[PDB]
Ligand binder design. Structure first.
Ligand code: BCB
Ligand code: BCB
Ligand code: BCB
Ligand code: BCB
Ligand SMILES: C/C=C1/c2cc3[nH]c4c(c3C)C(=O)[C@H](C(=O)OC)c4c3nc(cc4[nH]c(cc(n2)[C@@H]1C)c(C(C)=O)c4C)[C@@H](C)[C@@H]3CCC(=O)OC/C=C(\C)CCC[C@H](C)CCC[C@H](C)CCCC(C)C
Ligand SMILES: C/C=C1/c2cc3[nH]c4c(c3C)C(=O)[C@H](C(=O)OC)c4c3nc(cc4[nH]c(cc(n2)[C@@H]1C)c(C(C)=O)c4C)[C@@H](C)[C@@H]3CCC(=O)OC/C=C(\C)CCC[C@H](C)CCC[C@H](C)CCCC(C)C
Ligand code: HEM
Ligand code: HEM
Ligand code: HEM
Ligand code: HEM
Ligand SMILES: CC(C)=CCC/C(C)=C/C=C/C(C)=C/C=C/C(C)=C/C=C\C=C(C)\C=C\C=C(/C)CC/C=C(\C)CCCC(C)C
Ligand SMILES: COC1=C(OC)C(=O)C(C/C=C(\C)CCC=C(C)C)=C(C)C1=O
Ligand SMILES: [Fe+2]
Lengths: 323, 258, 273, 332
């Protein structure tokens, strides 16, 4: 067996290295230290970490959102500390229960939620700049920043843009562990079953597809760690037996194959599209489609099944039904 | 009236579904599938007595060449014609195109099958600052074994056939990633060292156990040109040698397990 | 027909069973014994699917559905049209899945590489079994499994979920989802990093292993390293099902109430009730 | 925190849709046994003689009964509601026609309500009918009632912890969660839906595309209506000890016909029945009850799905005394 693919048998210790940025080198704060147990399944050195303006900004806005949320949650168990720790998951910070339209809601009915919502956004923006800048400082392409951008956009979509598109803040995602979860059902229910939204189908496809792809990629690279498959950059500029063998595994199995670079593109594409497909799905919901199941029905896509228990008329529609 | 309705029965989301599909196949076929062809193309085959055409499909499926400008100097352009020129000791076992090749000599040394290497650069891999990357700890003196792990220097290496085959002399570290990649051993009864990639080693407290090959076959492990340096292509020869053991170390190994 | 580097690898040997009999390629495909079996079940399974689909009322692809038997048929054999087809197609699926798996082992053996891919492929097969075989066994009828249809299998997922009131509070599901989301994020991160180092833009030099490490150390204070992100990726991926398997198995054989209520074990500690 | 095999399962939809009930057999056995405490019918008496309208002084509702019949009913009424208390819970010990004690006049209104359900709400209660036992279960205060606030424990025969006490503001989210099957849904479906007929339970659109003029801005129902409807359904499910697929094919919650079971139509009538009981019988009783009965807003305790069903899809597993005590309806 190759135990190296399971864990690092003999860890190497050596001097801390620093690749110099086009700026910010003096913002790397902290002394590297080394975990021996971490060393067994990853690199042993934790820290240093770059500080920097964008990052500090992100930290500051993010922490303000958290204070707004935690403070409203704390109010909900009436500032009882033990009931706070007990009911945490159930605690939430909500949007307009009431229809204010796009009216700025009172602090008590969604005011605080738009606040936290706003600061969280600035937090995501600041962080994005950090993620984009660090690449440029280090002389790298910006592929990560752009994959991140799609993810943030998706949040914006369920957070702001959809609620704005239909004209109601009431539709936004609450903050809280069970609350943001309950929203998923409320939103699905209101819009006629998200299983029947084509773009939810695409998203899941790409999501499952990432599981498929990272299992197959990760496993492919462990399978050729013996030949230095893990050194992907140099297998790109100078193809070696690692990626030849990896490529042939996949050719002999499925009939076609990637290269060691292009598979990271398929990977990147599939990740990106989870969020991109999701965003379209949301932009279409409310704006142009009210009932996704009914929409499918309209277009002929829906399965239908026999009654098993007898078919039940709507009592409401009975002649001489109450209301 | 409805938000979204375009016409007779056409609505927005319905058009977007078609657009979505289109975008996905464009990117997949016209882009991703061509990026998949920067290595190993054009496909090779036998040939014909008379043939004087570019073969359109071989132009169509390829991407435009891209050029990497390499960190310490040079360029690589892909796709390019990397032909396999070097001769192979294999014989076709049947007449039909799909049939496997058989080695005609010793596949371990002839480097065929599992024992093949890529025609990698005869260049020493380099750290970011320009030094040699994979070097023995005799050379990488600022590196050490983490406290708690076995120091394998001194231990015997025990081949698949149970026989002690040498003594670990050194570990080669990757000073770009801080990670051991080979053991160096004094081959028993030869006046030589062998490297062996750490994935082929079972590191015990009292012995390193190497299952790929029998004690005899360490003899013909690929040789390095320098002693404190290893090229990208040498790494491939050394590694491939033991990978070849897994199929070829003994006669049984190429045949069905069950 | 051959990649430019391919001929030197196409050697005999590596088979699990069969030996030289099926040791050969059709086109790019390695065949082998299990290539032979894989194709037999695919053919079987697909023929069944067509015959079944023809007996039913639709040839619209989204609408076609081949469903398991009623609960009353228990774990017995059901009339072909009342879930008999479904039972057949399921044996065919398993045969194909597992043959696909073993065929990968023979290709791995021949290439002298780790068996990791066939191994990793066992996880999705395992989850197929939990849903279609194990859980229906524990509950006592084949009727609990999911139907074979593009859209109809979503209606089963839907109803199964709401059988337990809110499936989102299922702790096995929570773990599963988390792994789904982390994995998608990591694959984006990993693809992006490699592309960014190999493709910096303009005429910049391709960067290095030490840049990969530096970038994440800056961004998040840690870099797991090149071999180890592939290990992590396989782990996060596999734990999508390995943890999910539990939440699925538990619903019915081991918990019959809504999933929210399960959390009572926390909420209802008497110290704070 | 888990329940061992086997599970009892039923099918409520076409095969392969995963619709049906999922019962733990011990829990079902436990409710079975509790509902088994339903006292048997008192042996029938013969209608000898004069309607008690002649015979007695202050009989309004049951005046058509002969004496033995009437007292038969009074004995039953006593074993259902106030067994531990005997006749005098409602009667002046020395004057049977005395309305002195409130249980009297409440019992009088309850005899009217009980005849109402059995005569006018046959769409729901059918030929099973209800009796005083259905709600009361042998105690004057029925075990499962609803105020205009959430309260705990749901069975009021259990005595609260501090936090459960409605006065404890930090126990609210729990009071509410435990009313909606442990969800965090920040709504009380009782006061929203069941106390009256002000709100509309249906929230899902019945057109594929958004109708122009109901789909933007303040024209729109807020999304919070979807959480309320969901909460009402968590509540109903737990009230009946069942799951959604007892009533819906989750493919389309909003459709009927093949997409709904018979039990959903019945439940529709139950919603209607419950609102009626609440608006026209139970809520008025705040006029007639001690302050000790009334909630923090001065409301009388009222009925939801639980009050009768108490965690069973049919109350007392379908037991009836309707043939045995026709006084109680259906009133021809
Ligand atoms: C417990 C939950 C489950 C679930 C939940 C689920 C949801 C909620 C959704 C899907 C979706 C999809 N599912 Mg289902 N699913 C599918 C297949 C499918 C696809 C129709 C589609 C896209 C999936 C994807 O791209 O993954 C990644 C894999 C990739 C990218 C590689 C390509 C695979 C290829 C697209 C598969 C196509 C299969 C064809 C139907 C062929 C069928 C056999 C033919 C040859 C006879 C299979 C084959 C199986 C089996 C055998 O286990 C399965 C099991 C399950 N799905 C579970 C029961 N699935 C999505 C959909 O759009 O539904 C229609 C979606 O919304
Ligand atoms: C009953 C309800 C249902 C539902 C409702 C639902 C909704 C309402 C939505 C989805 C959506 C999606 N669903 Mg569906 N769903 C899914 C899977 C999925 C995803 C593929 C996709 C969401 C994309 C995502 O990754 O978000 C997770 C990723 C996120 C949230 C991005 C985060 C990025 C961000 C930058 C990170 C920031 C972190 C910071 C630390 C911030 C912290 C700051 C502090 C201050 C707070 C599966 C696989 C199934 C199955 C198997 O049943 C299913 C069933 C159902 N879903 C039910 C039918 N689903 C979405 C969609 O695709 O719409 C079409 C959508 O909106
Ligand atoms: C449309 C669908 C939605 C959805 C659906 C959803 C479901 C259905 C479920 C969750 C779940 C969860 N969600 Mg929700 N979600 C959450 C957050 C959460 C968590 C409470 C939990 C698990 C998170 C996770 O594993 O992600 C992945 C985690 C990541 C990517 C971790 C990042 C790792 C990292 C790179 C390591 C960093 C290194 C260190 C900093 C190093 C330190 C050393 C230094 C300092 C020197 C956030 C913060 C947000 C947004 C966008 O702000 C969000 C949006 C949404 N969720 C959408 C509304 N969510 C699960 C749950 O538990 O529900 C209760 C669950 O079941
Ligand atoms: C209303 C009901 C809901 C529901 C009900 C549900 C159920 C009932 C189950 C899940 C499960 C799962 N859900 Mg939930 N879910 C999920 C995500 C997920 C997955 C992580 C997880 C595993 C899926 C699976 O089993 O695939 C299975 C996929 C398989 C078996 C694929 C097999 C592939 C096979 C090996 C090969 C197939 C080959 C093809 C035929 C080949 C075709 C050849 C062609 C291409 C050439 C999210 C992220 C969300 C959101 C955002 O809300 C969500 C919402 C919901 N889930 C709803 C609340 N979910 C499962 C779980 O584990 O939860 C505990 C589960 O059982
Ligand atoms: C399909 C692809 C996807 C995708 C992609 C990508 N995702 C990325 C990137 C890409 C490519 C990045 O490059 C970026 C990153 O950097 O990675 C290293 C990132 C990220 N994805 C995160 C979370 C995540 N991704 C999710 C989903 C998807 N991602 C989808 C699936 C989910 C889901 C699943 O729920 C989650 C939860 C974060 C880890 C990270 C942002 C951090 C942030 O935005 O900073 C925001 C900053 C703050 C909140 C600062 C405040 C924090 C402190 C501790 C608060 C302390 C307060 C206290 C009260 C007081 C303290 C006082 C003090 C003095 C002591
Ligand atoms: C946690 C890790 C995961 C993971 C991992 C890995 N995944 C792998 C590998 C690894 C590592 C491979 O090595 C192997 C491969 O070769 O990759 C290219 C593979 C593969 N993953 C496929 C599909 C896929 N992976 C999914 C999920 C995950 N993968 C999870 C996420 C999903 C989901 C989520 O729905 C799908 C649909 C195939 C493309 C491929 C098998 C080909 C096959 O088996 O050929 C043999 C079979 C056929 C060509 C057809 C057989 C038809 C039968 C007889 C009749 C059909 C019946 C069927 C039940 C009907 C369904 C109808 C209805 C539901 C619609
Ligand atoms: C216990 C077995 C019991 C007896 C005995 C009893 C008797 C009784 C009689 C004879 C009357 C008629 C007296 C008159 O002239 O008005 C009567 C009327 C009513 N009762 Fe009674 N009663 C017994 C028990 C109970 C209990 C436990 C209650 C309260 C729940 C109750 C109530 C009433 C009511 C109301 C009436 C009038 C009924 C009407 O038709 O208007 N009784 N009782
Ligand atoms: C059946 C004919 C019947 C009788 C009799 C009866 C009596 C009754 C009394 C005596 C009270 C007052 C109790 C008190 O001490 O305050 C009372 C109160 C309530 N009831 Fe009742 N009841 C009869 C029937 C029914 C039925 C069928 C239901 C449920 C649909 C029901 C419910 C209630 C509720 C709620 C109250 C209010 C709270 C309270 O005062 O305890 N009863 N009932
Ligand atoms: C189980 C937790 C559950 C869910 C989810 C659910 C949802 C639901 C929705 C979305 C509606 C709205 C339909 C529309 O907008 O047209 C709805 C309506 C009704 N339900 Fe339901 N339902 C769940 C569970 C149950 C159960 C267990 C039953 C039957 C006892 C039931 C019944 C009904 C009825 C009746 C309605 C209509 C309400 C009215 O017309 O006033 N549901 N449900
Ligand atoms: C509260 C709005 C409520 C719901 C919901 C509800 C539902 C319901 C169903 C689904 C049935 C049918 C079950 C079946 O298997 O067919 C059913 C039956 C009866 N109900 Fe009910 N019910 C609700 C409320 C109430 C209330 C408040 C009472 C008691 C006054 C009550 C009573 C009954 C009775 C009796 C039946 C049984 C009829 C039978 O055929 O046995 N319900 N309910
Ligand atoms: C103000 C006006 C007029 C215009 C601007 C509109 C605007 C831009 C609004 C934005 C709204 C947005 C972005 C809303 C989005 C909300 C979403 C998607 C929220 C979803 C999930 C939230 C969840 C799960 C989290 C809730 C909070 C908690 C769990 C507590 C947080 C606790 C911590 C993070 C602990 C940190 C501890 C540390 C040591 C790691
Ligand atoms: C060769 O490629 C890669 C590495 O080698 C240098 C990494 O070190 C990392 C960074 C790994 C981190 C920050 C681990 C934390 C956890 C998660 C889930 C992202 C990534 C993404 C990568 O792709
Ligand atoms: Fe990689």
């Amino acid at each position: 067996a190759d135990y190296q693919t399971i864990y690092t048998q003999i860890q190497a210790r050596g001097p801390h290295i620093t690749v110099s940025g086009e700026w910010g080198d003096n913002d790397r704060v902290g002394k590297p230290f080394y975990s021996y147990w971490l060393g067994k399944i990853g690199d042993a050195q934790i820290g240093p970490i770059y500080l920097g303006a964008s990052g500090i900004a992100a930290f500051a806005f993010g922490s303000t959102a958290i204070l707004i949320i935690l403070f409203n949650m704390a109010a909900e168990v009436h500032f009882d500390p033990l009931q706070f720790f007990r009911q945490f998951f159930w605690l939430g910070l909500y949007p307009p229960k009431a229809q204010y339209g796009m009216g700025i809601p009172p602090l008590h009915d969604g005011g605080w939620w738009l606040m936290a919502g706003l600061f969280m956004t600035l937090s995501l923006g600041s962080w994005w700049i950090r993620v984009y800048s660090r690449a440029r400082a280090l002389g790298l392409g910006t592929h990560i920043a752009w994959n991140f951008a799609a993810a943030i956009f998706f949040v914006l979509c369920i957070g702001c843009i959809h609620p704005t598109l239909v004209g109601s803040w009431s539709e936004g995602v609450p903050f809280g562990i069970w609350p943001h979860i309950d929203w998923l059902t409320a939103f699905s229910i209101r819009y006629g079953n998200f299983y029947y939204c084509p773009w939810h189908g695409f998203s899941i496809g790409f999501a499952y597809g990432c599981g498929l792809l990272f299992a197959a990629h990760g496993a492919t690279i462990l399978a050729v760690a013996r030949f230095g498959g893990d050194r992907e950059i140099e297998q790109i500029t100078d193809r070696g037996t690692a990626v030849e063998r990896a490529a042939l595994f996949w050719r002999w199995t499925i009939g076609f194959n990637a290269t060691i670079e292009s598979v990271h593109r398929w990977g990147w594409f599939f990740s990106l599209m989870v969020m991109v497909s999701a965003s379209v799905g949301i932009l279409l919901t409310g704006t142009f489609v009210d009932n996704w199941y009914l929409w499918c029905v309209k277009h002929g896509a829906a399965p239908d099944y026999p009654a098993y228990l007898p078919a039940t008329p709507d009592p409401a529609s009975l002649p001489g039904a109450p209301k | 009236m409805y938000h979204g309705a375009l016409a007779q029965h056409l609505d927005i989301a319905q058009l977007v579904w078609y657009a979505q599909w289109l975008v996905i196949w464009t990117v997949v076929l016209l882009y991703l599938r061509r990026e998949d062809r920067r290595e190993g193309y054009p496909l090779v085959e036998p040939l014909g007595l008379v043939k004087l055409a570019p073969e359109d499909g071989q132009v169509y499926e390829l991407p435009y060449p891209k050029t990497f400008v390499l960190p310490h100097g040079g360029t690589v352009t892909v796709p390019r014609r990397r032909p396999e020129t070097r001769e192979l000791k294999l014989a076709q076992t049947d007449g039909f195109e799909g049939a496997p090749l058989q080695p005609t000599g010793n596949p371990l040394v002839d480097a065929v099958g599992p024992a093949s290497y890529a025609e990698r650069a005869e260049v020493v891999d380099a750290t970011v600052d320009g030094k040699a990357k994979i070097v023995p700890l005799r050379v990488a003196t600022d590196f050490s074994i983490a406290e708690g792990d076995v120091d394998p220097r001194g231990l015997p290496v025990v081949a698949a056939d149970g026989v002690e085959a040498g003594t670990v002399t050194d570990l080669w570290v990757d000073r770009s990633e801080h990670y051991f990649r080979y053991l160096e051993l004094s081959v028993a009864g030869s006046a030589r060292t062998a490297l062996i990639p750490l994935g082929f080693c079972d590191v015990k407290k009292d012995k390193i156990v190497v299952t790929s090959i029998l004690s005899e076959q360490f003899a013909n492990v690929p040789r390095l040109q320098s002693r404190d340096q290893i090229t990208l292509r040498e790494e491939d020869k050394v590694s491939a040698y033991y990978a070849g053991g897994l199929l070829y170390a003994t006669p049984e190994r190429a045949e069905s397990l069950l | 027909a051959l990649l430019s580097f391919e001929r030197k690898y196409r050697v005999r040997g590596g088979t699990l069973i069969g030996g030289d009999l099926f040791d050969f390629w059709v086109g790019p495909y390695f065949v082998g014994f299990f290539g032979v079996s894989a194709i037999f079940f695919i053919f079987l399974g697909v023929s069944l699917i067509g015959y079944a689909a023809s007996q039913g009322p639709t040839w619209d692809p989204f609408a076609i559905s081949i469903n398991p038997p009623d609960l009353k048929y228990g774990l017995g054999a059901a009339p072909l049209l009342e879930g008999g087809f479904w039972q057949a197609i399921t044996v065919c699926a398993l045969g194909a899945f597992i043959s696909w798996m073993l065929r990968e082992v023979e290709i791995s053996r021949k290439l002298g590489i780790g068996w990791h891919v066939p191994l990793a492929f066992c996880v999705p097969i395992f989850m197929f079994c939990v849903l279609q075989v194990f859980r229906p066994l524990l509950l006592g009828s084949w009727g609990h499994a999911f139907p074979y249809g593009i859209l109809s299998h979503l209606d089963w997922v839907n109803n199964f979920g709401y059988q337990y009131l809110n499936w989102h509070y299922n702790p096995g599901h929570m773990s599963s989802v988390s792994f789904l989301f982390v994995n998608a994020m990591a694959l984006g991160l990993h693809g992006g990093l490699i592309l960014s180092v190999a493709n910096p833009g303009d005429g910049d030099k391709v960067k290095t292993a030490e840049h990969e490490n530096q970038y994440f150390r800056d961004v998040v204070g840690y870099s797991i390293g090149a071999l180890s992100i592939h290990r992590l990726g396989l782990f996060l991926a596999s734990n999508i099902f390995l943890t999910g398997a539990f939440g699925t198995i538990a619903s019915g054989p081991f918990w019959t109430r809504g999933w929210p209520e399960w959390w009572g074990w926390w909420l209802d500690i008497p110290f704070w009730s | 925190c888990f329940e061992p095999p086997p599970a009892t399962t039923t099918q409520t939809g076409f095969r392969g849709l995963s619709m049906g009930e999922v019962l733990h057999p011990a829990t079902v056995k436990a409710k079975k046994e509790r509902d088994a405490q339903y006292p048997p019918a008192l042996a029938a008496v013969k209608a000898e003689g004069p309607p008690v309208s002649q015979v007695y002084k202050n009989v309004k509702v049951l005046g058509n009964l002969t004496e033995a019949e009437f007292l038969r009913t009074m004995t039953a009424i006593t074993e259902w509601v106030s067994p531990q208390e005997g006749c005098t819970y409602c009667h002046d010990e020395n004057n049977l026609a005395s309305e002195a004690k409130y249980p009297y006049v409440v019992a009088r209104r309850m005899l009217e309500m009980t005849r109402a359900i059995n005569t006018n709400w046959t769409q729901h209660v059918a030929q099973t009918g209800v009796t005083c036992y259905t709600c009361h279960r042998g105690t004057p205060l029925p075990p499962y009632v609803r105020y205009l606030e959430p309260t705990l424990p749901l069975n009021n025969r259990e005595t609260p912890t501090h936090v459960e006490r409605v006065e404890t503001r930090s126990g609210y989210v729990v009071r509410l969660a435990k009313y909606t099957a442990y969800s965090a849904l920040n709504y009380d479906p009782f006061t929203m839906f069941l106390a009256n007929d002000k709100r509309q339970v249906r929230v899902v659109p019945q057109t594929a595309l958004p109708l122009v003029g109901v789909s933007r801005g303040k024209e729109r129902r807020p999304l919070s209506d979807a959480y309320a409807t969901f909460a009402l359904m968590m509540s109903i499910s737990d009230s009946l000890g069942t799951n959604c697929t007892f009533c819906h094919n989750a493919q389309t919650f909003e459709s009927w016909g093949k997409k709904s079971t018979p039990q959903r139509a019945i439940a529709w009538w139950g919603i209607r029945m419950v609102r009626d009981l609440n608006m026209n019988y139970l809520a008025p009783l705040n006029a007639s009850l001690p302050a000790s009965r009334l909630g923090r807003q001065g409301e009388a305790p009222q009925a939801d799905c639980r009050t009768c069903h108490q965690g069973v899809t049919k109350p007392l597993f379908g037991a009836s005394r309707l043939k045995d005590y026709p006084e109680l309806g259906p009133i021809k």
